[PDB]
Design a protein around this ligand. Sequence first.
Ligand SMILES: *[C@@H]1O[C@H](CO)[C@@H](O[C@@H]2O[C@H](CO)[C@@H](O)[C@H](O)[C@H]2NC(C)=O)[C@H](O)[C@H]1NC(C)=O
Ligand SMILES: *[C@@H]1O[C@H](CO)[C@@H](O[C@@H]2O[C@H](CO)[C@@H](O)[C@H](O)[C@H]2NC(C)=O)[C@H](O)[C@H]1NC(C)=O
Ligand SMILES: *[C@@H]1O[C@H](CO)[C@@H](O[C@@H]2O[C@H](CO)[C@@H](O)[C@H](O)[C@H]2NC(C)=O)[C@H](O)[C@H]1NC(C)=O
Ligand SMILES: *[C@@H]1O[C@H](CO)[C@@H](O)[C@H](O)[C@H]1NC(C)=O
Lengths: 44, 99, 50
Amino acid sequence: FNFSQILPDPSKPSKRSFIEDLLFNKVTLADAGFIKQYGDCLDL
Amino acid sequence: LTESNKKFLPFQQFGRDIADTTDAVRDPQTLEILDITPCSFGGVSVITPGTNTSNQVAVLYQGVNCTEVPVAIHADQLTPTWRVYSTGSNVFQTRAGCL
Amino acid sequence: AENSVAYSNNSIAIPTNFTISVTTEILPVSMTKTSVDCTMYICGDSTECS
Ligand SMILES: *[C@@H]1O[C@H](CO)[C@@H](O[C@@H]2O[C@H](CO)[C@@H](O)[C@H](O)[C@H]2NC(C)=O)[C@H](O)[C@H]1NC(C)=O
Ligand SMILES: *[C@@H]1O[C@H](CO)[C@@H](O[C@@H]2O[C@H](CO)[C@@H](O)[C@H](O)[C@H]2NC(C)=O)[C@H](O)[C@H]1NC(C)=O
Ligand SMILES: *[C@@H]1O[C@H](CO)[C@@H](O[C@@H]2O[C@H](CO)[C@@H](O)[C@H](O)[C@H]2NC(C)=O)[C@H](O)[C@H]1NC(C)=O
Ligand SMILES: *[C@@H]1O[C@H](CO)[C@@H](O)[C@H](O)[C@H]1NC(C)=O
């Protein structure tokens, strides 16, 4: 039973799996306030 | 107030935002176009242990870089109660903000 | 599709093979933890509004 697609990949720096990487790619998420956007503002 | 790369039309005088507020202006004395960005603000969250145990307090300033916060006294409305933390002896930068 | 089951009191059907299906189900868990400054949103840097 192959599990490399759903087990996390050490090649990825953000250690999500391959299918998790495709899931994060397909869901369009704004940068929002996790980077705080503060010096960039000082765009929806 | 900063310099703006936005170029108005000759009959244009003001540039406006999504919420129908002024964002870009034309200076009356010299015909150059500026842009308005409102001044910095953010949330303040107070981290404390139990009052039964101690009285020391850490303070987190939310959403603001640490380049401003240890010099963000600026004669604030609420500065004499965070004045030792507006000085910033211990400064840490998180994704939540300046701690 | 229209499908009439061929019932009889002496007859039964038993499968001789199987399929292993990986069916994807998507469930939300959390949403955006928005926080609203009421004074700043209502009053655009106005002391008299505050
Ligand atoms: C488990 O699957 C992965 C991919 O799903 C296999 O890894 C590589 O897959 C690519 C195709 O995308 C092949 O070209 C490579 O040759 C594969 N790598 C290796 C080392 O063979 C992986 O091989 C699979 N595991 C097994 C045991 O077959
Ligand atoms: C918070 O402030 C720091 C320091 O000013 C910023 O780090 C600088 O980022 C720029 C590009 O964005 C680089 O050219 C500088 O070299 C960085 N300086 C240092 C000392 O590393 C940081 O980007 C700011 N973060 C935000 C979200 O505004
Ligand atoms: C049940 O269905 C499977 C479907 O694959 C049959 O498996 C055979 O599997 C081998 C390799 O594992 C393939 O090379 C064959 O082509 C498959 N057979 C067919 C007809 O496609 C399996 O034989 C079936 N079992 C029964 C009892 O019907
Ligand atoms: C006065 O306003 C005119 C345009 O209205 C501008 O060209 C000029 O630089 C201003 N200042 C003086 C000192 O004339």
